[PDB]
């Protein structure tokens, strides 16, 4: 079972290798996204 978590290691690497670039291409529009839905939620200040 010890090998098996040694065979893990492959696994983790590949994700993370996946994740990085999924990350880099995609983290500027979700940014944004976060920031158009906080703008949205702060917005209801004043006229209610």
């Given at each position: 079972?010890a090998?098996?978590v040694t065979?893990?290691?492959?696994?983790?690497?590949?994700?993370?290798?996946?994740?990085?670039?999924?990350?880099?291409?995609?983290?500027?529009?979700?940014?944004?996204?976060?920031?158009?839905?906080?703008?949205?939620?702060?917005?209801?200040?004043?006229?209610?």
């Amino acid at each position: 079972e010890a090998a098996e978590v040694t065979r893990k290691v492959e696994e983790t690497d590949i994700v993370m290798q996946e994740v990085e670039t999924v990350s880099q291409q995609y983290l500027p529009l979700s940014t944004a996204c976060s920031s158009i839905y906080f703008t949205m939620e702060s917005l209801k200040q004043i006229h209610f």
